[PDB]
Design an enzyme around this catalytic site. Structure first.
Site, PDB file in Angstrom:
ATOM      1  N   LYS A 171       6.444  -6.171   8.803  1.00 44.48           N
ATOM      2  CA  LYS A 171       5.392  -5.281   9.263  1.00 44.48           C
ATOM      3  C   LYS A 171       5.027  -5.558  10.719  1.00 44.48           C
ATOM      4  O   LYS A 171       4.958  -6.714  11.152  1.00 44.48           O
ATOM      5  CB  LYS A 171       4.159  -5.404   8.366  1.00 44.48           C
TER       6      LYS A 171
ATOM      7  N   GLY B 135      -3.808  -2.902  -2.098  1.00 45.50           N
ATOM      8  CA  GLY B 135      -4.496  -4.077  -2.595  1.00 45.50           C
ATOM      9  C   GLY B 135      -5.555  -3.832  -3.652  1.00 45.50           C
ATOM     10  O   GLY B 135      -6.240  -4.786  -4.042  1.00 45.50           O
TER      11      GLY B 135
ATOM     12  N   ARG C  57       0.731  14.027  -4.409  1.00 45.67           N
ATOM     13  CA  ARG C  57       0.539  15.431  -4.757  1.00 45.67           C
ATOM     14  C   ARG C  57       0.291  16.292  -3.523  1.00 45.67           C
ATOM     15  O   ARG C  57       0.748  17.441  -3.462  1.00 45.67           O
ATOM     16  CB  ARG C  57      -0.615  15.575  -5.748  1.00 45.67           C
TER      17      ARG C  57
ATOM     18  N   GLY D 117      -1.366   0.439  -4.576  1.00 50.11           N
ATOM     19  CA  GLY D 117      -2.026   0.499  -5.854  1.00 50.11           C
ATOM     20  C   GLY D 117      -1.117   0.549  -7.059  1.00 50.11           C
ATOM     21  O   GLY D 117      -1.626   0.575  -8.183  1.00 50.11           O
TER      22      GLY D 117
ATOM     23  N   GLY E 113       3.120  -4.615  -3.679  1.00 50.00           N
ATOM     24  CA  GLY E 113       2.814  -5.870  -3.031  1.00 50.00           C
ATOM     25  C   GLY E 113       2.024  -6.755  -3.956  1.00 50.00           C
ATOM     26  O   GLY E 113       2.526  -7.754  -4.490  1.00 50.00           O
TER      27      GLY E 113
HETATM   28  C1  LIG Z   1      -0.028   1.335   2.344  1.00 49.97           C
HETATM   29  C2  LIG Z   1       0.787   0.298   2.196  1.00 49.97           C
HETATM   30  C3  LIG Z   1       1.288  -0.493   3.346  1.00 49.97           C
HETATM   31  O1  LIG Z   1       1.025  -0.153   4.490  1.00 49.97           O
HETATM   32  C4  LIG Z   1       2.100  -1.743   3.122  1.00 49.97           C
HETATM   33  C5  LIG Z   1       2.939  -2.011   4.380  1.00 49.97           C
HETATM   34  N1  LIG Z   1       2.876  -1.627   1.858  1.00 49.97           N
HETATM   35  C6  LIG Z   1       2.692  -2.936   1.186  1.00 49.97           C
HETATM   36  O2  LIG Z   1       3.824  -3.754   1.520  1.00 49.97           O
HETATM   37  C7  LIG Z   1       2.537  -2.875  -0.342  1.00 49.97           C
HETATM   38  O3  LIG Z   1       3.803  -2.601  -0.951  1.00 49.97           O
HETATM   39  C8  LIG Z   1       1.489  -1.888  -0.859  1.00 49.97           C
HETATM   40  O4  LIG Z   1       0.297  -2.601  -1.214  1.00 49.97           O
HETATM   41  P1  LIG Z   1      -0.163  -2.968  -2.723  1.00 49.97           P
HETATM   42  O5  LIG Z   1      -0.595  -4.414  -2.743  1.00 49.97           O
HETATM   43  O6  LIG Z   1       0.986  -2.756  -3.687  1.00 49.97           O
HETATM   44  O7  LIG Z   1      -1.351  -2.143  -3.143  1.00 49.97           O
END
Ligand SMILES: */C=C\C(=O)[C@H](C*)N[C@H](O)[C@H](O)COP(=O)(O)O
Ligand SMILES: */C=C\C(=O)[C@H](C*)N[C@H](O)[C@H](O)COP(=O)(O)O
Ligand SMILES: */C=C\C(=O)[C@H](C*)N[C@H](O)[C@H](O)COP(=O)(O)O
Ligand SMILES: */C=C\C(=O)[C@H](C*)N[C@H](O)[C@H](O)COP(=O)(O)O
Ligand SMILES: */C=C\C(=O)[C@H](C*)N[C@H](O)[C@H](O)COP(=O)(O)O
Ligand SMILES: O=P(O)(O)OC[C@H]1O[C@@H](O)[C@H](O)[C@@H]1O
Ligand SMILES: O=P(O)(O)OC[C@H]1O[C@@H](O)[C@H](O)[C@@H]1O
Ligand SMILES: O=P(O)(O)OC[C@H]1O[C@@H](O)[C@H](O)[C@@H]1O
Ligand SMILES: O=P(O)(O)OC[C@H]1O[C@@H](O)[C@H](O)[C@@H]1O
Ligand SMILES: O=P(O)(O)OC[C@H]1O[C@@H](O)[C@H](O)[C@@H]1O
Lengths: 266, 272, 274, 262, 262
Positions: B78, B150, B162, B211, B232
């Site tokens: 990132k 997150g 959608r 999410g 994530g």
């Molecule tokens: C909107 C998501 C992002 O900008 C980042 C770069 N994507 C992350 O790596 C995760 O895969 C998404 O976050 P999560 O903890 O699954 O909600």
């Protein structure tokens, strides 16, 4: 490309004055005065403004009478979005269609898809974003507008300075910032970049609206226009010649004095 | 034939995959062994970034290198939005993708990275079709359609998936003459709007991100028309990440098999 | 002219990093890392922001200890409009006075009349109008400011892009329109025209506020800055002496990604911003 | 029975319905090729200018117009005035138009048109209004502009709105149609019928502001099945020109011919 | 060259500039003792009443006025209309007045007056406006009232405003002048020049509403260098009375004499 050819046709009008005419006699007077083209219509913008009513495409019969009375190109107005009026005008054999704000708007949300036509279109604008949007729709030539029919140059100055100032800003803008600039203009990025590379509008740009005197016309040329439209400001055979002269010799104050002297009431 | 088209083709290879956020070489191996199509190297998961606060930046090049050496699948990292130097560093490390990410702290509130200036492909986020096309015009080779990062809550990802896919469907049958105004309303380049119209889908790979917490969430995103998912927090902030990682990979591969979805969800433990 | 000499003097800082320091040992680390100058102060911006209270000029004693511990130029901060703090700093024999927004404002309506001083001043700005007003008051060097003490580069990017974007707009502007442009900047017309003719600010322009990483510092250089100030980013981090060297090398090698990778690699924990 | 009324109205497809105020105008309309006439005592432009309460016309003037032509005869009834509709049906005319250009008689409810044997035409400005009118029993929909102004702009807006919503509906995710019907405040079953047909479930004409042959052809190129004209005509030449423009709406040469010197 | 233009304008100090519409009026003005004439086709009071767009006068009527007197001849150009200014300069007149009483041609920018050889007069309502006009190249400033009303109130307000700000500036702490220039949105160097001179760096006349000898003398006692009069006069007696009042503005006996029975 078909578009680049239409753009080349309008480029032949550079340095010219386009005059609104309402009959064959006015057409000849404009031609004899040196107008680069005539704009065929039933009532001029000063009259459209004061009379009210709905203003539409002129009768094909009157447009034909003007087309055959002169040998310079003939333009005619269609209402914005009224693609059928443009089909009729194209079928008459005129040289340009002007998708015009001075007629009653036919479509509030969409302009004519001008790429669907063989003959070049003129469209109006008040800022760079509008001009680029009209060009993307297929406009071969841009009118930068003031207030039609008022004889007052103030808005034409405002909009010409706005369009040309945005072009100047674009010239040395950080390339990385052009994407956001295109977003803020709500304009197609490719056309924004084309304008940046040229340092000018990708098609001919005339001023239109409120050009009443030779000084007004030369002012538009000095601010960077390629020509002017005059509608009400003439009809008068002598005033037409003076405006033509003012545009041809816009940097010659001696010539501007000669044609302005004793010109009569504007 | 074009350089951008080659980058778009690289991201095509990830279709049907799950991209996992990892914070060390060990989690990178778990991700690969569970079948992730790629890993996203970072120093804090989005759930940790959200709670802890502070400024979130590009990860240390050292920790990225340790991740790239520990796996054979592609490695992404990132960069902060608009931080083109972070992206220059990332590309000089030799990773496979740069994710210009909203979950790190914005570096430039008015401009994104000019991604055409780079040889490696970029992922960017969006919440609507206009944003997606703008990021693409800037050079993104792949698009994340974002939910809430997150939170473990799928609602915003559903809303934005959608929204993006709904506007694409609207474009399909739209009167050609109305597309110019549509492009204006989207503040999106007209040529890319027309390409989306002709394709009937986004011009680049579209993943869901934000999410995705359960196998059902992941399969929901695929059934709604995504090409893949980023996860994530949902894996490593859960009870059994290695089991949940495989479960989510399986759900994306077999998203139309309710039998498979039951098997991988049964006894899976506590989500995040 | 005397002002032209102060402007010329600060040209020597181009390509450099100026580091905030609170003691002689920190100053020695800054100099050995290759800083072009040190900023002597009693609290770094991150500490000023967190702790509160009134922040003023530092005790002349600690300034003297820093000035004698290094051979590179020493700068010190005075409150905005506190021309007596500046008289004292000039009498100590330091090299630059920084009339600084991170200290508590002493005068909300007027800055120091910097032409009354023999030593050059650095002032902050957030836009081109502010920069030109500071220069007209006599600043010999401009800090284009982000948010001090946060480790967040976003405002510095915003303000650097603003100042430089306005200069680019000005370069190509119709001459007849510059009078109004100067009115709308509320900036002295003569300085606006000088900026237009030069195509850049008439004085050295550094970035300051939130530069936490080598990547941040090189970013400010690629955006057109002449150098960077770093205060909190170095000594509020894991290994300051190594991080100081890394930021110096990032400013020197700002267009070289392989060098940026090398200096950023394994650099330890950056500052905990906000 | 409703599908019978819907099928009858399909015979008007490609036609011009002209407003008329006497037998002679009716005959000129018919001879110019109109597919039907709309009998009334005041043209919409005169309704606007004069003001006052506008109602169903005298049954006597409607009978005369009916006796004077062989093409279908329509007549207008006030919105919600189901008794005016009973009288018109008893006259033996072919269509009742529940018309917004007469003074509204019921601000909250339209005629329950299923209670009548003869087909009704209702107006609309958007797809939700059209489907509600259809569910009430309208066999034909007028997508409305501004009546009596000669200005096509609102007709263009409303035609683009109805047809654009239909195009959106056509490839919408089925799962999202329930919410779409709620947002339209329209019956879900008619929304699905519209989605499956890919067009409005009844004949759709443009009405309001159609002044020139070019306007009429524009309405056809935008997807209408026909047009109403009231003020625009009254004259036998302009009536024929608009009929021609609707019949040959994709032919620019014909549009020039009928427009030239008009 | 700018200081040459500034010095030329200083010759008008103590004078009355009269608006005139023909050669005869020009001669009456001159014979009454005017220091200059302002040639135009419409007096300000007639510009207000009639309305319409007001522009530069025909070069023909300006030449006639120029040929008919030996005192300097001024003429008005629309604000920002640098081409009207080029024509006036080519006519050979002595001053161009970039005038707010003509229709504004450019709402955002004035003429770049440094591009011209002949001196310009600009208007102002406050010290910030006067200095901006001067930085653009105006050699002379008109502190404006309401033109064409015959009411002196705004001229009194604006004269008191400009001169009061100058008096404030004169003994302001130098350190505070930088902020003062910012608040005026005026060039700092001109602000300092004004502070050092203790008056405006160019000739300052009052204009707008000067109707009686008493008004004219009031403008002089408030600190003006002279006055413009347009509507107030047209008549040879009133013109002479205002000239006398400006020449002898501190003499109440003279003011009675010229005012008595006027
Ligand atoms: C909107 C998501 C992002 O900008 C980042 C770069 N994507 C992350 O790596 C995760 O895969 C998404 O976050 P999560 O903890 O699954 O909600
Ligand atoms: C804005 C101007 C227009 O839309 C029309 C089409 N241009 C006219 O033909 C005239 O040339 C401009 O009007 P004018 O009477 O000159 O003010
Ligand atoms: C805005 C910055 C300032 O006014 C001070 C004087 N500059 C500081 O010395 C630092 O270099 C900037 O603060 P930082 O801690 O780097 O955010
Ligand atoms: C909205 C139109 C109507 O309700 C009526 C019933 N239709 C009229 O008969 C006309 O055909 C439309 O009016 P026009 O005079 O053409 O504008
Ligand atoms: C504000 C005044 C002006 O712009 C013009 C140019 N001055 C006039 O010539 C008159 O002298 C002032 O007008 P008046 O009729 O005296 O009120
Ligand atoms: O914003 P876009 O749609 O590009 O154009 C707006 C102009 O189009 C017409 O309706 C009017 O002339 C209006 O000024
Ligand atoms: O509107 P554009 O410029 O396309 O992008 C806005 C997005 O870019 C970033 O600032 C934020 O992520 C925000 O949501
Ligand atoms: O140029 P001006 O507006 O006078 O100065 C503005 C700055 O001066 C100080 O008050 C603050 O730092 C503020 O940002
Ligand atoms: O479908 P709903 O909203 O009930 O009907 C709206 C129309 O019904 C009549 O009163 C008016 O013509 C109005 O425009
Ligand atoms: O100095 P600025 O504010 O630019 O000029 C203000 C005057 O400029 C002209 O438009 C009007 O006369 C207005 O009163």
């Amino acid at each position: 490309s078909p578009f680049s050819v239409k753009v080349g046709l309008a480029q032949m009008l550079r340095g010219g004055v386009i005059m609104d005419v309402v009959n064959a006699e006015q057409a000849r007077i404009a031609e004899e005065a040196g107008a680069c083209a005539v704009m065929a219509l039933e009532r001029v913008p000063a009259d459209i403004r004061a009379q009210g009513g709905v203003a539409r495409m002129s009768d094909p019969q009157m447009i034909k009478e003007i087309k055959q009375a002169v040998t310079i190109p003939v333009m005619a107005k269609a209402r914005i979005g009224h693609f059928v009026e443009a089909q009729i005008l194209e079928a008459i054999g005129i040289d340009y269609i002007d998708e015009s704000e001075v007629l009653t708007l036919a479509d509030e949300d969409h302009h004519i898809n001008k790429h669907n036509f063989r003959i070049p279109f003129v469209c109006g604008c008040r800022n760079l974003g509008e001009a680029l949007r009209r060009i993307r729709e297929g406009a071969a030539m841009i009118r930068t507008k003031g207030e039609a029919g008022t004889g007052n140059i103030i808005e034409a100055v405002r909009h010409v300075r706005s369009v040309n100032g945005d072009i100047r800003v674009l010239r040395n803008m950080d390339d990385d910032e052009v994407f956001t600039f295109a977003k803020k203009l709500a304009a197609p990025y490719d056309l924004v970049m084309q304008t940046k590379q040229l340092g000018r509008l990708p098609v001919v740009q005339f001023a239109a609206g409120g050009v009443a005197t030779p000084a007004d016309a030369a002012l538009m040329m000095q601010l960077g226009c390629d020509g002017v439209f005059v509608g009400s400001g003439i009809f008068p055979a002598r005033r037409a010649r003076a405006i033509v002269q003012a545009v041809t010799h816009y940097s010659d104050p001696e010539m501007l004095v000669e044609v302005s002297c004793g010109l009569g009431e504007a």
